[PDB]
């Protein structure tokens, strides 16, 4: 009946960024006041609409995109933006209607011994189109002459985040939730 926004914001485990999770919220009366009355969720930037006029739409497909990218990688979650995360990890269209509610989660997602549990692909020959999920799991390798293993010019694409608790705000695991009203 009400909106399972706490089952996403107030959830325990998110997904890996290269294969980010995407939960579809529906049929709920979204009380945005729980997140709009004050500012506990850091950046609250809405692209195209206003926070005060959020009730004048229809909840056809509100795709609450849940993932952990980085502190200074939320800037690459803007419409018409390019970068390492935007080219091929998660691409947002130029004409994008939605909001970004990224909030810090340093204490929840960290490990003194090293939280090597969140992966992003680093090298790619091509680029990916918007409105396209990345759920397939092929295996790739580098160029020059065909090779095997981490040789002279051959590298493993998916490399892991450290996520030790004492990082800076720009590298701390900001749990980013992106709403795409469509």
């Amino acid at each position: 009946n009400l909106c399972p926004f706490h089952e996403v914001f107030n959830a325990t485990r998110f997904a890996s960024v290269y294969a980010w999770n995407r939960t579809r919220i529906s049929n709920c009366v979204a009380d945005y006041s729980v997140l709009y009355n004050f500012a506990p969720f850091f950046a609250f930037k809405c692209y195209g609409v206003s926070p005060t006029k959020l009730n004048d739409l229809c909840f056809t497909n509100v795709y609450a995109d849940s993932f952990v990218i980085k502190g200074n990688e939320v800037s690459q979650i803007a419409p018409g933006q390019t970068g390492n995360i935007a080219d091929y990890n998660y691409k947002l269209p130029d004409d994008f209607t939605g909001c970004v509610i990224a909030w810090n989660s340093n204490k929840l997602d960290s490990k003194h011994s090293g939280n090597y549990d969140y992966w992003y692909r680093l090298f790619r020959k091509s680029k990916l189109k918007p409105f396209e999920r990345d759920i397939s799991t092929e295996i790739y390798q580098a160029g020059n002459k065909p090779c095997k293993g981490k040789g002279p010019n051959c590298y493993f694409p998916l490399q892991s985040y450290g996520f030790r608790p004492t990082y800076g705000v720009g590298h701390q695991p900001y749990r980013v939730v992106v709403l795409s009203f469509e």
Partner: antibody
Amino acid sequence: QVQLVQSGAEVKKPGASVKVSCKASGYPFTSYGISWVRQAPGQGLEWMGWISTYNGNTNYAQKFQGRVTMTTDTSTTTGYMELRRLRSDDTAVYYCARDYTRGAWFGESLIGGFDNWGQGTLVTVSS
Amino acid sequence: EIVLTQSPGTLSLSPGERATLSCRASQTVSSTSLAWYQQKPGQAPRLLIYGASSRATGIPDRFSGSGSGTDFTLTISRLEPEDFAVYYCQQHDTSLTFGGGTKVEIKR
């Protein structure tokens, strides 16, 4: 203004089965579940199970893997827990907390804990 | 089936000291799945710390919690007479299990 109306004491005997009542009030019913915790006299708390009132999913502990069942009432926002094959050591005080430890719809998990508790229910079983 | 083995057993203190309780797990437990409770004698427990860091609704400032991985702690700064109750620890990282409990008595 949180209210958790809970049933009274019982004097049942071994060999039968009983179900406990738990009326909650003051919150959106379908956005949360109901958990149950059992505490024997002069003992510590031990988990019994978890149930979501949204989709009817359940989750029981291995110690009571099959000996127990949980039902819910949506009209009265009332939770239930039914235990079977009452043993001599089954005498305890049963509590009915409010779930914020696992999501109702999604069911994955939530960062929280049992936030609102009832009054307790002493069920004494003896021959 | 992580065992929490709450320690110590009882706790008798004076009206004004500092209170501290421990809950130590066998395996590694995520900090997002541990909570605390306070049970007054004859009543039901009530949540104090959820998420191992946050404070529950209506809980005064003298209550605090921390811990991650294998060791967790509850902290009370001032000991008013109502701060003598029964406490427990909980985890739901992998299945839901409780602690042994720690009664808080009055030292005289």
